[PDB]
């Protein structure tokens, strides 16, 4: 099977938000609204904002999962390459095979679906803090898009789902991701090609 990637705000008006980091050669993570694509360096912080019109119930969670963007590769589980899954760089919670990790959240849970074998990381949804209007989750991508034997230059999409305590769908959003050496230059190049 293949997880749905259909945008769905749901009853709570759920949607993602990204910072405006620019395209300076030095940038480590930058989002392109025109391409709905996040460009980031290997294992660097990727801030993802969670916006809602109304607060969902306590027990609500937020899950992140990657799938290949190209339909001919959609059924293939996205995982870290043969090299990175063996580099012993786990933070003590993320299985070494998982591409996506959540930074600084001890309540993060990593799932290896017993039926689909797909990987995902889920955390409890926390309402915005006093003074804040959104909640932010910091993600890390643990392989380059170019890793041989892994993504192998194939583009991926990250699907973020808001779910209830049973795992039922409440909202969904998604974006393409390219993990590369120079996010600033690649974003500029791809946006130029689009122009
Ligand atoms: Zn890799």
Swiss-Prot record:
Listed result of changing residue 188 to H: In a brain tumor with no family history; germline mutation and in sporadic cancers; somatic mutation
Outcome of swapping residue 55 to N: In a sporadic cancer; somatic mutation
Reported impact of residue 146 to P: In sporadic cancers; somatic mutation
Impact after mutating residue 153 to Q: In LFS; germline mutation and in sporadic cancers; somatic mutation
Impact upon substituting residue 143 to G: In LFS; germline mutation and in sporadic cancers; somatic mutation
Effect of mutating residue 174 to G: In sporadic cancers; somatic mutation
Outcome (variant: residue 24 to D): In a sporadic cancer; somatic mutation
Disease: TP53 is found in increased amounts in a wide variety of transformed cells. TP53 is frequently mutated or inactivated in about 60% of cancers. TP53 defects are found in Barrett metaplasia a condition in which the normally stratified squamous epithelium of the lower esophagus is replaced by a metaplastic columnar epithelium. The condition develops as a complication in approximately 10% of patients with chronic gastroesophageal reflux disease and predisposes to the development of esophageal adenocarcinoma.
Protein name: Cellular tumor antigen p53
Organism placement in taxonomy: Eukaryota, Metazoa, Chordata, Craniata, Vertebrata
Gene: TP53
Boundaries of the shown chain within the full protein: 96 to 290 of 393
